Design a binder for this molecule. Structure first.
Ligand SMILES: [Mg+2]
Ligand SMILES: [Mg+2]
Ligand SMILES: [Zn+2]
Lengths: 128, 203, 175
RNA sequence: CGGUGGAACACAGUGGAGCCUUGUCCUCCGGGUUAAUGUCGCUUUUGGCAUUGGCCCCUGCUCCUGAGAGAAGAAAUAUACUGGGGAACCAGUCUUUACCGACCGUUGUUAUCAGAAAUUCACGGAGUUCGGCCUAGGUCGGACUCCGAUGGGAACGGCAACGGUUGUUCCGUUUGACUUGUCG
RNA sequence: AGAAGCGGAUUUAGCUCAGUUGGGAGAGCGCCAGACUGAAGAUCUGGAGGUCCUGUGUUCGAUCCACAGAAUUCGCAUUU
């Protein structure tokens, strides 16, 4: 089919960008969890901001993420869904996950099992 | 009510930083009504007599370990700062600091055009385009502090894991870079006239 | 001509540790009692399935039960099968997450055997949530849950910086 | 960057030639009222649909031009939408007593991968309505609505170019005073 | 050291200059190195070498597109 070339020289600029993205994601997630465990929604517009900036940096250097991150974050307001509103299933569709802002992220689950994403398949992925 | 606030994240962030300043002013008024100078007694006084006012108050004692450890460990991983210091490379480190985001940094106003802005340490909750947002504690003050960047000099310490032997201190200038973090991810910084920096020689 | 290019993609650095399913051992001592009890429920009458032992086997009822509607029953136990094909991964990446924010003492048990496709093919979906309030079953459930089947969280408990994880995916590009 | 002193208030400043779709006193679409006709249900009569005819629907200000600045209570808290600013606000698309609103059409582009799909191609599932075989309501076709892991993404959304405006295009000046030469 | 006002063209590696559906940042010369020669030139191969004038904003992404701020340089029946 073609040529098989596997380079492990990672580039320094991409490592800087993905470390910046991962630091923004970690600080937003830890702010959200440290606020959520103790008491009510104090600075929930704060951490979301980081994610939005993160997504804008994901728009800059043409970078792509795993579907775990984009499944975690929202699409319109770009907030973390670690505490969502409601989870419904088999309500004449497949699945529904409601949020506080009203934007839902549904998944086709009533069709068939044993479906994996392209990054979750057996050999398509090499760690580090 | 809750849906109309978080429609835009910027406007809700502005509403939150206004609510923190209003709650800090109400805290100063209730503290002068309390006539107790101790802040640890003041927080319990607010918990006893003002439940709804206590809900939007910041927690700096919580804010320090949740930010400083992550920031220092991220810089120790990113700039390759290890036990072996004699293999360091400064130019690539300054390029990485030009590429790294300063959201969540501890930073100190060391020199400024205004004589009252200096001496302020604080941790970044958000980076604006031409201003700067930190948080600092006083005796009883817990106000979100906005500081201009046009004509100010900022500094931050990068510690090393050894105790009292060696540590690093770097400095940035907010009048030099005046953009969002999004543009700063892609921007290659270039030369300027730098004529308005006489204050850095003056004071 | 087709050429294969490896593209660097940022991983969720803690999803492996957030999906560290709990340590389970000496598990064939448990499926005997569990399967015998579930069959003895499912034989007689559909009302008598849930009348002496209250259990919910629909995920919408799991969310509505853990939302905060019923707060009396504090020890509530859950059984979820992993390492099993024909099981949806969309729910399975969110089942141990939703039980963490529940204020009730919810005890997740991960069943490790791959051949256990019986409970999915028989009851509803392959998961079981029930209450140990005054039932006889708790008289052994409290016995073994302290031994090997402990469920605790190390990842959110203490303050710790997490190292970054950048993986790389395959891409076939025709020219 | 602009325009004026050439145009005399649109008298397109005027004239001539060529071409055509031969310059249509035309038409905003659209919304409301009134009159007439035909069908369908209540039965002095009214209601709904379609056609035809008539009316009503908003130069923000100064200025020849270029341009300048004012306000968005006819649906909001941020005073139409979108992005930023630290806030007066700025930029772009717009509207201005709109007592009804109106983002013009065509062409191409959004590279590789991904995904069913990079432009209302198509495909898969659910619901409704109609027709044929048929009558425990099974199947087939057509129409509408909603959803489908991916990516900034499915949004008739973003970018670039061109015009139907009172037919297009070309050519010439309406700009001078003294000195000299010719002609009457 | 021969202004002032007007139109056109134009800035990319040290230099001279390309180039652009908008998705890679280049060629010649020069420098270094290899090859070659008794030695050198020429020829040939490879590497080093970037503020794409600067800034805003559009976009998912700018040498390119829009705006703003600088300028480079030619011509004005000339060789001063
Ligand atoms: Mg002048
Ligand atoms: Mg001038
Ligand atoms: Zn959301």
């Amino acid at each position: 089919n073609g040529t098989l070339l596997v380079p492990p020289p990672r580039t320094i600029a991409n490592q800087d960008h993905f470390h910046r993205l991962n630091y923004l994601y970690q600080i937003s997630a830890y702010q959200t969890r440290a606020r959520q465990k103790a008491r009510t929604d104090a600075h929930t517009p704060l951490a979301r901001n980081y994610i939005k900036s993160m997504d804008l940096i994901s728009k800059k250097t043409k970078t792509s993420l795993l579907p775990t991150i984009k499944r975690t974050i929202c699409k319109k307001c770009h907030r973390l869904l670690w505490t969502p509103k409601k989870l419904e299933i088999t309500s004449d569709g497949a699945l529904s996950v409601m949020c506080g802002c009203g934007t839902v992220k549904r998944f086709n689950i009533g069709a068939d099992p044993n479906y994996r994403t392209y990054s979750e398949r057996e050999g398509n992925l090499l760690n580090s | 009510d809750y849906q109309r606030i978080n429609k835009n994240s910027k406007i809700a962030l502005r509403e939150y930083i206004n609510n923190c300043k209003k709650n800090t002013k109400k805290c100063l008024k209730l503290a002068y009504e309390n006539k107790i100078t101790d802040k640890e007694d003041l927080l319990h006084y607010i918990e006893e007599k003002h439940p709804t006012i206590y809900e939007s108050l910041p927690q700096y004692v919580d804010f320090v370990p949740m930010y400083k450890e992550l920031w220092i460990n991220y810089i120790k991983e990113l700039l390759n700062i290890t036990k072996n210091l004699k293999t360091f490379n400064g130019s690539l480190a300054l390029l990485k600091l030009s590429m790294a985001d300063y959201n969540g940094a501890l930073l100190r106003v060391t020199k400024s055009k205004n004589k009252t802005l200096i001496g302020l340490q604080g941790i970044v909750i958000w980076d604006s385009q031409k201003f700067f947002i930190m948080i600092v504690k006083g005796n009883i003050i817990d106000e979100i502090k906005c500081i201009p960047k046009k004509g100010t000099v900022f500094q931050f310490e990068i510690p090393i894991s050894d105790d009292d032997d060696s540590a690093l201190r770097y400095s940035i200038l907010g009048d030099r870079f005046k953009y969002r973090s999004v543009d700063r991810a892609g921007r290659k910084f270039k030369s300027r006239r730098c004529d308005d920096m006489l204050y850095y020689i003056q004071n | 001509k087709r050429r294969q290019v490896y593209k660097p993609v940022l991983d969720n650095p803690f999803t492996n540790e957030a999906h560290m399913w709990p340590r389970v051992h000496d598990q064939p001592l448990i499926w005997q009692l569990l399967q015998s009890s579930i069959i003895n429920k499912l034989i007689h009458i559909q009302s008598k399935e849930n009348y002496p032992w209250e259990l919910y086997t629909d995920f919408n009822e799991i969310v509505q039960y853990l939302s905060g509607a019923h707060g009396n029953s504090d020890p509530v136990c859950l059984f979820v099968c992993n390492k099993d094909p024909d099981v949806p991964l969309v729910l399975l990446q969110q089942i141990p997450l939703l039980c963490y924010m529940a204020p009730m003492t919810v005890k997740l048990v991960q069943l490790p055997k791959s051949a256990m496709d019986t409970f999915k093919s028989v009851s509803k979906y392959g998961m079981l949530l029930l209450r140990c309030d005054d039932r006889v079953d708790k008289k052994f459930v409290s016995q073994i849950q302290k031994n090997v089947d402990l469920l605790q969280f190390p990842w959110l408990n203490a303050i710790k910086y997490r190292p970054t994880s950048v993986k790389l995916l395959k891409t076939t590009v025709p020219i």
